[PDB]
Design a protein around this ligand. Structure first.
Ligand SMILES: */C=C/C(=O)N1CCC[C@@H](n2nc(-c3cccc4ccccc34)c3c(N)ncnc32)C1
Length: 282
């Protein structure tokens, strides 16, 4: 159904006129994402506007992402949908208003991201990918820092399922078996962890996409450096995530039992204040 907004257990009958446009969020999108304030409850939400006049391929990925998000209402590690509005010319998709992605966080930091923040990020992303494979049999196929969203309250969720499968992403984070033919998102997560932990994308100085694919297959997996104080569990988790042979790469339920994940499930990391600190320096 449409015309409703479920923000915090309570449902609210609403139309597009009940939301005040506070401006466009982000310059480059897969569809116009607006910051909007719900006049009836003061809630500020993120509303993606899909025009029926828009691009055919872009609208297909928007609906595919919306399909997965509507199915993931019980996963706390996936950005939640609040409702939809279908007009004669547009489709508005209201979603959880996050802060920013991990890519923009890396640009604002102008350096590495602490391990304690990446530890909480790993636990959230791995469980989100595990929820898609078991509860819905869905593969993400585009795990990257730009698809990891954080907010003022320390939440870390996964966001874009535009090219998700039911069982091609960015070439920079593609697994070897996806270039030269299940657990391909595990490799993408490992590549994203190295980029955020070092501040430098591991495959450096690649002018074309095919050259990146060449380095993925020809070069050794880019492991975590050993002169940055990374814990033994962090370097161990990245090594298993970046196993070249996918048959030896651990499935999720073995990853969820890794000492790196088990540590940051119980550990109390103040991601909310670290996020608020970095955001104060643009
Ligand atoms: C690195 C991510 C980033 O820079 N951008 C541009 C700014 C806005 C970011 N973003 N996207 C959404 C969003 C909301 C609803 C549905 C979907 C579906 C697929 C991809 C993104 C989204 C954002 C929300 N809700 N909140 C903050 N930022 C959002 C993407």
């Amino acid at each position: 159904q449409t015309g409703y907004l479920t923000i915090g257990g309570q449902r609210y009958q609403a139309e597009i006129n009940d939301l005040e446009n506070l401006g466009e969020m982000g310059s480059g999108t897969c569809g116009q994402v607006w910051k909007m304030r719900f006049r009836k409850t003061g809630h500020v939400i993120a509303v993606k506007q899909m025009r029926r006049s828009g691009n055919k391929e872009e609208n297909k990925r928007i609906l595919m992402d919306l399909d997965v998000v509507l199915k993931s209402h019980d996963c706390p590690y996936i950005v939640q949908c609040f409702g939809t509005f279908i007009t004669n010319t547009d489709v508005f998709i209201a979603m959880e208003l996050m802060g920013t992605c991990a890519e923009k966080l890396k640009k604002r930091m102008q350096g590495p991201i602490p391990e304690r923040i990446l530890g909480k990020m790993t636990v959230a992303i791995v469980k989100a990918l595990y929820y898609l494979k078991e509860k819905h049999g869905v593969i993400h196929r585009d795990v990257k820092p730009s698809n990891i969203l954080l907010d003022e309250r320390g939440q870390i969720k996964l966001c874009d399922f535009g090219i998700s499968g039911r069982l091609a992403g960015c070439a920079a984070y593609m697994a070897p078996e996806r270039i030269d033919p299940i657990r391909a998102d595990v490799w993408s997560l490992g590549i994203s962890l190295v980029e955020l932990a070092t501040g430098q994308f591991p495959y450096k100085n690649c002018k074309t996409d095919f050259e990146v694919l060449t380095k993925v297959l020809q070069e050794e997996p880019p492991l975590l450096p050993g002169h940055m104080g990374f814990s033994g569990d962090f370097q161990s988790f990245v090594k298993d995530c970046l196993t070249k042979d996918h048959r030896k790469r651990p499935k999720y339920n073995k990853l969820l039992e890794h000492s790196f994940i088990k540590r940051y499930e119980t550990l109390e990391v103040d991601v909310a204040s670290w996020f608020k600190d970095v955001m104060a320096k643009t």
